[PDB]
Amino acid sequence: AAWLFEA
Amino acid sequence: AAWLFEA
Amino acid sequence: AAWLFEA
Amino acid sequence: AAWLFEA
Amino acid sequence: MKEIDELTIKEYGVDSRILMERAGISVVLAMEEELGNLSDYRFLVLCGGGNNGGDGFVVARNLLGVVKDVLVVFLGKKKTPDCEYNYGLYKKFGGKVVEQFEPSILNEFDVVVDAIFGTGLRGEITGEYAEIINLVNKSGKVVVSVDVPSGIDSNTGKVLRTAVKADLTVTFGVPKIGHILFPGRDLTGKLKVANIGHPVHLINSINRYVITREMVRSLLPERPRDSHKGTYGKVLIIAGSRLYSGAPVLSGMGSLKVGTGLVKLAVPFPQNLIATSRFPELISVPIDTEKGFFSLQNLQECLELSKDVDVVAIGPGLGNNEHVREFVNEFLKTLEKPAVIDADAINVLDTSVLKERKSPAVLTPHPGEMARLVKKTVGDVKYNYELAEEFAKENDCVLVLKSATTIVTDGEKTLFNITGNTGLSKGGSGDVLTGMIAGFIAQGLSPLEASTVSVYLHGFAAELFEQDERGLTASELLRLIPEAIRRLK
Amino acid sequence: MKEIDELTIKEYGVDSRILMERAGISVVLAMEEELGNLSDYRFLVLCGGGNNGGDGFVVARNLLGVVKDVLVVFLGKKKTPDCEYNYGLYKKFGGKVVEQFEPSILNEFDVVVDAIFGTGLRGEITGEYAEIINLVNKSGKVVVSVDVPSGIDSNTGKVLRTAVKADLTVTFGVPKIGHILFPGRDLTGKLKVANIGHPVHLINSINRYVITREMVRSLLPERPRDSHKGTYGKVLIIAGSRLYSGAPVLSGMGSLKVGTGLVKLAVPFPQNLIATSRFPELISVPIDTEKGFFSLQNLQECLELSKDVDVVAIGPGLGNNEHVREFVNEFLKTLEKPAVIDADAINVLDTSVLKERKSPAVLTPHPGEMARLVKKTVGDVKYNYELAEEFAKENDCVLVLKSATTIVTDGEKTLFNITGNTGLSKGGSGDVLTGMIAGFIAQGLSPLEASTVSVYLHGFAAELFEQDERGLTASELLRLIPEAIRRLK
Amino acid sequence: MKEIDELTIKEYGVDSRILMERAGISVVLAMEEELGNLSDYRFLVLCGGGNNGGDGFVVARNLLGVVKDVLVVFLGKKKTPDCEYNYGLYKKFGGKVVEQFEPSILNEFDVVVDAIFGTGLRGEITGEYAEIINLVNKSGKVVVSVDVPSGIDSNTGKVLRTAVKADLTVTFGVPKIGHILFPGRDLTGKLKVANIGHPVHLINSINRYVITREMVRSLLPERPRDSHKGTYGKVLIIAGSRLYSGAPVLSGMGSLKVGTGLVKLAVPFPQNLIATSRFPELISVPIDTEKGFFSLQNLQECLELSKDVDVVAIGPGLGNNEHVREFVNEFLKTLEKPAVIDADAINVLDTSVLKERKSPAVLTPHPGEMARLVKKTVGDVKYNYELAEEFAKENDCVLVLKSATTIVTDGEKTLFNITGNTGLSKGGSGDVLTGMIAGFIAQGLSPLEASTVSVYLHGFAAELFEQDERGLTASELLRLIPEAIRRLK
Numbered sequence A, B, C, D: 001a002a003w004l005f006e007a
Numbered sequence E, F, G: 001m002k003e004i005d006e007l008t009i010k011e012y013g014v015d016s017r018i019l020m021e022r023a024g025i026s027v028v029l030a031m032e033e034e035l036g037n038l039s040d041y042r043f044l045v046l047c048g049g050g051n052n053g054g055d056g057f058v059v060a061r062n063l064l065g066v067v068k069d070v071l072v073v074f075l076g077k078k079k080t081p082d083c084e085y086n087y088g089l090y091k092k093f094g095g096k097v098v099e100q101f102e103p104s105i106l107n108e109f110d111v112v113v114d115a116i117f118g119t120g121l122r123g124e125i126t127g128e129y130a131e132i133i134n135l136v137n138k139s140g141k142v143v144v145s146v147d148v149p150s151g152i153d154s155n156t157g158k159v160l161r162t163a164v165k166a167d168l169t170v171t172f173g174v175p176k177i178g179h180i181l182f183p184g185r186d187l188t189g190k191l192k193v194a195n196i197g198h199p200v201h202l203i204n205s206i207n208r209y210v211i212t213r214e215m216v217r218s219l220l221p222e223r224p225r226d227s228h229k230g231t232y233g234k235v236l237i238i239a240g241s242r243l244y245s246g247a248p249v250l251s252g253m254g255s256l257k258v259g260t261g262l263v264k265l266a267v268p269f270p271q272n273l274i275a276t277s278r279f280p281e282l283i284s285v286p287i288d289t290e291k292g293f294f295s296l297q298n299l300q301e302c303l304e305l306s307k308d309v310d311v312v313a314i315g316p317g318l319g320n321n322e323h324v325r326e327f328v329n330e331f332l333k334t335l336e337k338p339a340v341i342d343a344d345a346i347n348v349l350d351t352s353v354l355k356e357r358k359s360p361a362v363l364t365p366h367p368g369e370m371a372r373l374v375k376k377t378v379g380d381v382k383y384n385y386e387l388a389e390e391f392a393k394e395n396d397c398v399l400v401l402k403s404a405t406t407i408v409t410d411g412e413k414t415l416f417n418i419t420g421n422t423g424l425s426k427g428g429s430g431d432v433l434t435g436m437i438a439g440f441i442a443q444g445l446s447p448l449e450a451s452t453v454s455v456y457l458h459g460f461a462a463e464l465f466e467q468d469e470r471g472l473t474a475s476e477l478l479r480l481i482p483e484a485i486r487r488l489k
């Protein structure tokens, strides 16, 4: 779930 | 529950 | 819910 | 939920 | 209700100001019930110069200091004394009134309170009143109508050129005819009837009624445990033809699903065999006809079949030609049993027959059939409860005038039914209702009682359908009747 | 509120009859809220000759035709105009009034509506009024009191020889002092305050307040994310002795549990070691004393410890002998920081010191300590909010007079606290509260605000205890404070 | 869409590289949506020399450093400019490219990204491209196709000798015909349509549509509450014969289940009795025939029955012999009502009749019936949307060409339906659809709208069947229509 965004 | 209002 | 009564 | 993809 | 307010004030001695205060606070409490906490909303209150607008000033005043914003637009020229009193209080409490309606004003408010016209509306709305109402209807704001949506004739439910479409209508003492008949029923949205202090005796002196769940539950016949089929009556249904073979079947099961003991159909051979192939619990007597329709040659056999029953239903699917007309009229003149008269039996009926009958009758026309029967237009008869009352009284019958709101009257008592949906706007629906009415009569209800219970339950059963209402058929309606009865108990 | 009714009528122009109608219907709606559907119950309405009894006639009239039975027993001699008007309406609507109370009459009713006396009661109730009220209290019927239970002095909460014990009291506009102070608080049962149409401006001109959840939530200080301990203040607590070694510990954690940054105790050696053995996050400075109690020889050290804090609390467990008295008074005369003064510091206080201080102070006496401080009896000072106001005003302080209802006043604003239970009637409870108040002051609340928030939260924490309240101890109360804060948000 | 890309670049000024980057990242996001976290997987990216392969280089590059392994096999000879640009970026970022496909290479990867050919494929795939695609299809790895599975003709859905079978296809801007028609629909697997930045105006200038839930919900007719059966229209169905007695019944209930008010069947006696024995809410008129089939002797009666309806459906179960042909053609030439023409009425139809009719018509052939009607082979007409468009335009009709993907066209607008399953590949299915279409026309939808809504809902109802689809029958489909309507709302 992290290709686009880091929290 | 009906002193004031009838449905 | 408070127009008529405060608890 | 549809800016990128239509099903 | 004009009578009821006047009497409460003039005879009982309740101050007009007390009635008006109670009306307005009832609107506030009703809005709170529907919206939740009121304190976040901004209220635009539209007040006329009458007592309706007076009620509106009471609403507005009681919101002051408790909600986000209130503004009154006063739209009249003069004010009744009570409206003037409550206007003065609204201003004394710090309230803002403008006398000019500006279209952009709708933008800054969440709820519109419609206190423009109540039961005092006479004549078409034109002018700037019409412009204002049309703007409110295009605004998409939440609309709460005081007493009746402005523009509805409270006596008929007709729109007087234009009317407010309300999400919530709060009316006082009793519902008005205009909330009950369409189009007004549609414009009312959700209806609350508030008790504003009229004596309960005056409220009950009303001669026209809405058919309620409690009324129907009290009329349902008893099922004593030590019973047998004869306890619950016997119905003959004279129905069907070579053209219309399904009608008998729907009428017959209609009677059986409401608890009738024995149901017998008289149907032209071989159409009579259709009934038992579907529901073998029906008795479907073959009638020998010349060309597939009842005629005078079947008179004597139908009279014989009638001797051993409690009620006869006639008309569904009979066809309408001269030979059916001669049969129907001679049978009904000679039959000394209650009759439920529907459909093609209504289309060929000689009303002089009704006057000469000793036994009772129920007539179940839709407005097309009613129009033919009194020689008027559909627009003349539709929702015309005074005409229905006159007809029931003159012909000594119960008249069930079918439509989305059904009218049931014997000429002294008139009841309005509001159960049902558009799934009943489909062939076969009426045929079921005819059977239900005959059935209840056979079980011991008077024609008026049987009619009242049947119209309610027929509509309520439609509402129990689990999928989209437009897909409802009469065969599914039948299946749902016993559920409607269970839920009613 | 006599002012508020008079002004609403005389200045705003609301008819007295409108107020009275709204009062009575509010009682009906309130009963329905508590009882459910009213229609099964039989109501005995007891009406005096005043406006309270007038309100009762309104209640009675509005039940006519809707419930199982209503009867009014009229107990007065004469009727005010509004009572006379509503009596007349009750009779015109078909209502039954008797003028004789017969003990067996209670047998035939389910609910007693007490509309005998309201805020007009003056003097002891004797005579047949007293007999009637005593019969109602022994009847075990459901009792609903109009405005205030009859027999309570609405200004003080005292019982005027005898009073009705109510399950439900419906009062109008605002709560009265008599609902808030005991014994009246106990006799009120569940209290509902109904809006009967007074302008919200008049209702808010009130100078005495009940401390509410919303008030406390709006006063809680902010916790900016980029903070450090100094952001949240620093407290010195001067406390304890060889006799009373626990008090420091409870006061200190009191400050820490409400979010204070740094808490420092000054406690006679070796009692100071008790604190950190229990809560090592406390700083507990050992003070060298001659005989286990603070004296003038510790004055300079305590002043030095005070330079680096925001607030000082003094008194819990100090003991009371002459040397403590000399210390306490000279310290407080010289300390230029806010002070929270409790317990033994109150017992030895010279009130002239308070008058000469430039810095603010909060005093937290129970009524025994208050009695000693003003040289009166406990009965003279208990619940005596006017005396507390006078004392706060004369001494330029905030006074927190502790009891089941706590009074907080600076002489201009007075607030009443009704949170808490009897688990707080146990040693150690007060010591925690002192710490809470100092803590909130250190965080930036004014003495009045800090006091208001602390008394509410201290009581609410007690109510969060999971087992029987009598088993609550101060150590458990401490654990519950952060839960009370969470729930408040 | 070639137009759409060219215009976006040449007229709107979006750089080709921006479109291509957005295409590739959309593939990555789509895979993540279907696979979860990508970081554990090894990706084999197969790139051609065109812009499809360019998109693939973008995919590959964006996986570098984030997933377990990426390898590109470049399979072309030359590269378009954008493919060359993205190849260069892939290498500059550290990516590995080989130019030789080795069968064992599949062993070391989890996901194959198919970026070999897109919409630029012309002609049969032979050679080593074919070998590679066949190896990928036998590999059992997860296959993600860029734009269209390689080997599908994007204009027709035909396989160009061999094609990739994809688990997931990500296409850009709009679906292509090749995703919608079979076999391509089967090879596409799950389809996602990504927005890559074309102006929404260009995307909406498309003249061919996929029938969606939102489109159908917006077309469903309104059910005004004050309605009666006539509000919802009246259908005549001319159907059945001694050979085919069930077809009338399925067509009729088809109309009733979609909310039509009145449905009348004309069916040769005694087959007409079959209908009401099953569904007594139908009117089933007996038609006297010589040998069990309609002929010219029934022309006048069928015209008379048509005067009082809104639409006529004709054809299901009529049989096909010369006398049926003479009847059907003379009836349709004379009928001045909309007609829905199905089954045997299509088999005997003279298309010159359609051209001379003033009133509208809908034709509902399967490809066998279409083939007969235009004198071509089934392979010539199946999925041939341009031929359907031409026929609809030349004959001024709506053509509904039934198959797993149904084509609905009036010659200007063409819609594709993808609801339904193989339970509809069973006798009786078409008969229901004919009734649904007539019904919606009777309710006020245009022939094109009625057709669009009906094909969608007929397929969706099939998908609501609770057990295995192969066991679906037309009688169960009927039961499910109102559920499909409910779910659509």
Ligand SMILES: CC(C)(COP(=O)(O)OP(=O)(O)OC[C@H]1O[C@@H](n2cnc3c(N)ncnc32)[C@H](O)[C@@H]1OP(=O)(O)O)[C@H](O)C(=O)NCCC(=O)NCCS
Pocket (backbone or CB within 6 Å): E001, E002, E005, E016, E019, E020, E023, E048, E049, E050, E051, E052, E053, E055, E080, E082, E116, E117, E118, E119, E120, E121, E122, E123, E124, E125, E126, E129, E147, E172
């Ligand atoms: C008496 C009663 C029949 C109607 O009186 P009303 O309530 O004052 O009437 P409304 O408020 O609806 O409207 C009255 C005014 O609206 C305006 N109005 C009516 N028809 C209009 C029209 N077609 N075009 C423009 N304005 C119109 C008129 O100004 C009318 O009086 P007017 O012609 O002298 O100007 C009614 O029963 C009533 O008085 N009260 C209703 C119950 C209630 O509100 N309870 C509280 C206690 S009063």
Ligand SMILES: CC(C)(COP(=O)(O)OP(=O)(O)OC[C@H]1O[C@@H](n2cnc3c(N)ncnc32)[C@H](O)[C@@H]1OP(=O)(O)O)[C@H](O)C(=O)NCCC(=O)NCCS
Pocket (backbone or CB within 6 Å): F001, F002, F005, F016, F019, F020, F023, F048, F049, F050, F051, F052, F053, F055, F080, F082, F116, F117, F118, F119, F120, F121, F122, F123, F124, F125, F126, F129, F147, F172
């Ligand atoms: C004016 C106000 C201060 C008191 O007036 P009131 O409400 O009429 O007073 P009550 O009803 O409590 O009782 C008044 C009467 O009770 C009786 N009463 C009072 N003390 C009594 C005693 N100790 N022994 C016996 N009877 C007594 C008296 O008869 C007194 O008047 P009286 O001495 O002339 O006989 C009060 O604020 C008020 O008028 N209304 C309260 C709010 C309200 O009810 N709202 C509605 C609108 S009025």
Ligand SMILES: CC(C)(COP(=O)(O)OP(=O)(O)OC[C@H]1O[C@@H](n2cnc3c(N)ncnc32)[C@H](O)[C@@H]1OP(=O)(O)O)[C@H](O)C(=O)NCCC(=O)NCCS
Pocket (backbone or CB within 6 Å): G001, G002, G005, G016, G019, G020, G023, G048, G049, G050, G051, G052, G053, G055, G080, G082, G116, G117, G118, G119, G120, G121, G122, G123, G124, G125, G126, G129, G147, G172
């Ligand atoms: C222009 C467009 C119609 C086709 O161009 P394309 O995308 O480069 O075409 P593809 O990638 O599918 O394939 C093109 C090449 O595949 C190869 N190819 C085509 N048919 C073949 C065959 N039957 N056998 C072997 N190779 C073949 C060819 O090499 C062809 O060009 P060539 O004959 O000169 O060698 C297309 O609309 C397009 O350019 N882009 C699609 C949308 C997109 O990807 N968006 C991003 C922005 S470009």
Ligand SMILES: Nc1ncnc2c1ncn2[C@@H]1O[C@H](COP(=O)(O)OP(=O)(O)OP(=O)(O)O)[C@@H](O)[C@H]1O
Pocket (backbone or CB within 6 Å): E343, E365, E366, E402, E403, E404, E405, E406, E419, E420, E421, E422, E423, E424, E425, E426, E427, E428, E429, E430, E431, E432, E433, E458, E459, G224, G225, G226, G227, G228, G229
């Ligand atoms: N929109 C609606 N809302 C509520 N009830 C309705 C609606 N439309 C029709 N009905 C009810 O359905 C029944 C219709 O019977 P009616 O005889 O009027 O029509 P029908 O088509 O002739 O039925 P049948 O074919 O059995 O004679 C009536 O009870 C009517 O009140």
Ligand SMILES: Nc1ncnc2c1ncn2[C@@H]1O[C@H](COP(=O)(O)OP(=O)(O)OP(=O)(O)O)[C@@H](O)[C@H]1O
Pocket (backbone or CB within 6 Å): F343, F365, F366, F402, F403, F404, F405, F406, F419, F420, F421, F422, F423, F424, F425, F426, F427, F428, F429, F430, F431, F432, F433, F458, F459
């Ligand atoms: N019944 C009660 N209901 C609510 N609050 C109460 C009750 N009894 C006591 N309290 C509260 O508990 C606290 C008692 O503190 P106080 O100083 O008056 O008694 P204490 O025994 O001296 O406690 P400490 O030993 O800590 O000094 C006060 O806040 C008081 O208001």
Ligand SMILES: Nc1ncnc2c1ncn2[C@@H]1O[C@H](COP(=O)(O)OP(=O)(O)OP(=O)(O)O)[C@@H](O)[C@H]1O
Pocket (backbone or CB within 6 Å): G343, G365, G366, G402, G403, G404, G405, G406, G419, G420, G421, G422, G423, G424, G425, G426, G427, G428, G429, G430, G431, G432, G433, G458, G459
């Ligand atoms: N595999 C499938 N997927 C989706 N829809 C299908 C499938 N097979 C058939 N259908 C649909 O079912 C219906 C078949 O009707 P058609 O008239 O073509 O066949 P039929 O056997 O003649 O039915 P009938 O006997 O009623 O005439 C059409 O709507 C068609 O689109």
Ligand SMILES: [K+]
Pocket (backbone or CB within 6 Å): E052, E114, E115, E116, E117, E118, E145, E146, E147, E148, E149, E150
């Ligand atoms: K109104």
Ligand SMILES: [K+]
Pocket (backbone or CB within 6 Å): F052, F114, F115, F116, F117, F118, F145, F146, F147, F148, F149, F150
């Ligand atoms: K009282």
Ligand SMILES: [K+]
Pocket (backbone or CB within 6 Å): G052, G114, G115, G116, G117, G118, G145, G146, G147, G148, G149, G150
């Ligand atoms: K591809």
Ligand SMILES: [Mg+2]
Pocket (backbone or CB within 6 Å): E342, E343, E366, E430, E431
């Ligand atoms: Mg009918």
Ligand SMILES: [Mg+2]
Pocket (backbone or CB within 6 Å): F342, F343, F366, F430, F431
């Ligand atoms: Mg203390």
Ligand SMILES: [Mg+2]
Pocket (backbone or CB within 6 Å): G342, G343, G366, G430, G431
């Ligand atoms: Mg077919």
